[PDB]
Design a protein around this ligand. Structure first.
Ligand SMILES: [Mg+2]
Ligand SMILES: [Mg+2]
Ligand SMILES: [Mg+2]
Ligand SMILES: [Zn+2]
Lengths: 94, 131, 38, 136, 141
RNA sequence: AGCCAGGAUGUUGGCUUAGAAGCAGCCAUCAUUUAAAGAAAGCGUAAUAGCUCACUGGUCGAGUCGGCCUGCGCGGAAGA
């Protein structure tokens, strides 16, 4: 079972997202279901190691944000154009 | 795959045969000929028993860690090598006979062929069966 | 010996050494495998 | 040598080569040679790299060429002044942006594909990396 | 000796013990001549392999002659004569590499369990069975 | 890592059937025998020998091995 620790993003946009990726994190979004989308930031290397497994993109993941556990599914991934890095991940709820 | 737990299991699996059967033996590593060593091992596996295993997991730590459940004097892992061979047809069987006869004949060394007496009360030839 | 800009181990016995700031390949097996500069 | 048959215009503006690439995923095969640099790939370079791959892997498996030149490059002949019209088309190049997957290979072991891509990469003017296909 | 002192491996089938005319001078390191090549091998290899695969020992003893422990009939000559198909490797994928049946292996064992042995007699039978079946084919019988 | 050592006698392998020689072309073929026999490593590779792919045992007691990313360096680097 994959457990991801997330933080709610305070700032969003081009400048903030690039600052995250310089800080070795990367933005992610949790949407789907009935409640509002949740913009989160993930620590890049731990998620990159986890996503190396093929089952990362099939099983249900749990995201630990604000203490609250969220069952999510990897919906989409934005990879760096030529580097082994993640730029953004879409998470659909459940 | 001689790992940490694997050698832990190897010692226990090798000591189980000793605790269930009779005295075992070993064979050192000084010089080996193709025909000489193979035929001796082939003959040993035929007479003493096909369950003979020349595998050696008798390191100075692994041997004393697992095997020492019974006969705590089993800390003699000083041998140059180990090649085990059980003796199903009684104690001091052809396994002991072949080892004691090949310790100085048609072989380089047999790790002195010390033997593992079950009670270890004393060292005896046990070559007499009055009847 | 060879003074190529790209020096590599040509066989198993080639060793890479860095004498005097120059990266050399020394082989105990093939004198043809002696290469000079990194 | 790849070249568009029956192009609409003979000559083309020089243009620029800004931005990142589009075909950045291993789409057809399982292994890819991705360009981490920027530049032009001529038809000759593409053919030379393909032959290096096709010989390293002895014509086994399938090799895809994701890039097609489709850009005519003109040159003026030697000892001609500036002006007097645009030069004659001499060769064709594919504009390459970082992230562009250039070749795809399938039906080949991973280490053999890596060595095949190394031989092909030595024929190319752009820095490249070895990439494998990913789930999503 | 089975462990040939000069094991220059070039010897025609057991019909003629180590025929140097068929081996040529590339295995000339041997010193076999009429003194120690047509005395023991040419007289004790009749019921072992008649025109079948059986290597000939090129050993030379230290007693001015050549005489030491030989072995039983060759497995490659018994398990194949009791099978019929004289094929094997090299063309084992396109066609059968020979017949390796339970009867053929048992006969090979019953013929080669005299001196050619391993960890047991059944182990020698396993060697005979492998020598027949590993050629590239085995019969389901 | 170094050191105490080893690894066919069915097996010129059934094998391109004159073998291509325990490791030429030759296809697979531990084939129990395993501290080991791969039907192949440099020697002999067309071939004996003593070293010896690999592989362990034995010794002897803290790490060792490769990758990936990244900072700064090294070679590549010859003119009047
Ligand atoms: Mg800006
Ligand atoms: Mg100097
Ligand atoms: Mg520099
Ligand atoms: Zn070298």
């Amino acid at each position: 079972m994959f457990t991801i620790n997330a933080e709610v993003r305070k700032e969003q946009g081009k400048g903030a997202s690039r600052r995250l990726r310089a800080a070795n994190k990367f933005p992610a979004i949790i949407y789907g279901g009935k409640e509002a989308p949740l913009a989160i930031e993930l620590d890049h290397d731990k998620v990159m190691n986890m996503q190396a497994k093929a089952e990362f993109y099939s099983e249900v993941l749990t995201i630990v944000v604000d203490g609250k556990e969220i069952k999510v599914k990897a919906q989409d991934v934005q990879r760096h154009p030529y580097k082994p890095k993640l730029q953004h991940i879409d998470f659909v709820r459940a | 795959m001689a790992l940490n737990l694997q050698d832990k299991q190897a010692i226990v699996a090798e000591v189980s045969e000793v605790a269930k059967g009779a005295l075992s033996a070993v064979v050192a590593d000084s010089r080996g000929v193709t025909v000489d060593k193979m035929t001796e091992l082939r003959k040993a596996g035929r007479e003493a028993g096909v369950y003979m295993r020349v595998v050696r997991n008798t390191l100075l730590r692994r041997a004393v860690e697992g095997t020492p459940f019974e006969c705590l004097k089993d800390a003699f892992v000083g041998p140059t090598l180990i090649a085990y061979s059980m003796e199903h047809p009684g104690a001091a069987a052809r396994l002991f006979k072949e080892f004691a006869k090949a310790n100085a004949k048609f072989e380089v060394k047999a790790a002195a062929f010390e033997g593992e007496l079950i009670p270890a009360s004393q060292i005896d030839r046990l070559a007499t069966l009055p009847t | 010996m060879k003074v190529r800009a790209s020096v590599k181990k040509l066989c198993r016995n080639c060793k890479i050494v860095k004498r005097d700031g120059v990266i050399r390949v020394i082989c105990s097996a093939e004198p043809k495998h002696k290469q000079r500069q990194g | 040598m790849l070249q568009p048959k029956r192009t609409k215009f003979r000559k083309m503006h020089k243009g620029r080569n800004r931005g990142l690439a589009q075909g950045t995923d291993v789409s057809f095969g399982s292994f890819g040679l991705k360009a981490v640099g920027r530049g032009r790939l001529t038809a000759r370079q593409i053919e030379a790299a393909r032959r290096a791959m096709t010989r390293a892997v002895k014509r086994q498996g399938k090799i895809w060429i994701r890039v097609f030149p489709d850009k005519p490059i003109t040159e003026k002949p030697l000892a001609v002044r500036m002006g007097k019209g645009k030069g004659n088309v001499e060769y064709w190049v594919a504009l390459i942006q970082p992230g562009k997957v250039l070749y795809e290979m399938d039906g080949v072991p991973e280490e053999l594909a890596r060595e095949a891509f190394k031989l092909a990469a030595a024929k190319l003017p752009i820095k490249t990396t070895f990439v494998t296909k990913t789930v999503m | 000796a089975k462990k040939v002192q000069a094991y220059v491996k070039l010897q025609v089938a057991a019909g003629m013990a180590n025929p140097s005319p068929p081996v040529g001078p590339a295995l000339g390191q041997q010193g076999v001549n009429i003194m120690e090549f047509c005395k023991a091998f040419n007289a004790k290899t009749d019921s072992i392999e008649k025109g079948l695969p059986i290597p000939v020992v090129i050993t030379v003893y230290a007693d001015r002659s050549f005489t030491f422990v030989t072995k039983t009939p060759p497995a490659a000559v018994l398990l194949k004569k009791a099978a019929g198909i004289k094929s094997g490797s090299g063309k084992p994928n396109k066609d059968k590499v020979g017949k390796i049946s339970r009867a053929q292996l048992q006969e090979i064992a019953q013929t080669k369990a005299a001196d050619m042995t391993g960890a047991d007699i059944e182990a020698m039978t396993r060697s005979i069975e492998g020598t027949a079946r590993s050629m590239g084919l085995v019969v389901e019988d």
